[PDB]
Write a protein that binds this ligand. Structure first.
Ligand SMILES: O=P(O)(O)O[C@@H]1[C@H](O)[C@H](O)[C@@H](OP(=O)(O)O)[C@H](OP(=O)(O)O)[C@H]1O
Length: 128
C-alpha cells in the first residue's frame, strides 16, 4: 500500500546513454502528519562515487498520484557500468523545510537490460 510507480528505461548503447523516464505514481501512502504530499523521485546508480550518481525529478505539490512525465538521462554509461551497476529508484515527499520523508523504492539490475530495447515498468514500491 506504499504505492505503485510507472517508468521506462532505454539504453542507447551507441551513445553511452541511459534514459530513465519517470512517468507516474499511484496511491502514495500518507505518512508524517506534519509532512506534505509533495512527491519527487530520486535515481541512484550503485555502486557510485556519490554526487554524480544521483539524479532527481521535479517536486510536485499536494498529490498522492503524481505525474512527472520526465526523462532523466545518465550520460557516459558504458557496458562495464551496465554489467556492474544497479539503478535504485526511490520516492520521497519533500516537507515544509526542504527536508523529506522516504516512502519507498524499487531496484533494477542493469545487466537485465538489452541494448536499444525499451523496457516498461509498473511496480509496487517497497521498503528495504
Ligand atoms: O542535489 P539534488 O538535485 O537536490 O539531488 C538530491 C540528491 O539526490 C540526494 O541524494 C537527495 O537526498 P535524500 O534522499 O535524503 O532526500 C536529495 O533529496 P532532497 O530534495 O531531500 O534534498 C536530492 O534532492
Amino acid at each position: 500500500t506504499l504505492g505503485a510507480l510507472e517508468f521506462s528505461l532505454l539504453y542507447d548503447q551507441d551513445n553511452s546513454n541511459l534514459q530513465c523516464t519517470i512517468i507516474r505514481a499511484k496511491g502514495l501512502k500518507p505518512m508524517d502528519s506534519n509532512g506534505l504530499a509533495d512527491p519527487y523521485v530520486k535515481l541512484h546508480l550503485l555502486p557510485g562515487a556519490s554526487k554524480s550518481n544521483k539524479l532527481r525529478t521535479k517536486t510536485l505539490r499536494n498529490t498522492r498520484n503524481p505525474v512527472w512525465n520526465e526523462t532523466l538521462q545518465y550520460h557516459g554509461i558504458t557496458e562495464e557500468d551496465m554489467q556492474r551497476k544497479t539503478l535504485r529508484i526511490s520516492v520521497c515527499d519533500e516537507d515544509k523545510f526542504g527536508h523529506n520523508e522516504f516512502i519507498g523504492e524499487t531496484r533494477f539490475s542493469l545487466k537485465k537490460l538489452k541494448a536499444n530495447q525499451r523496457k516498461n515498468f509498473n511496480i509496487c514500491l517497497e521498503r528495504v
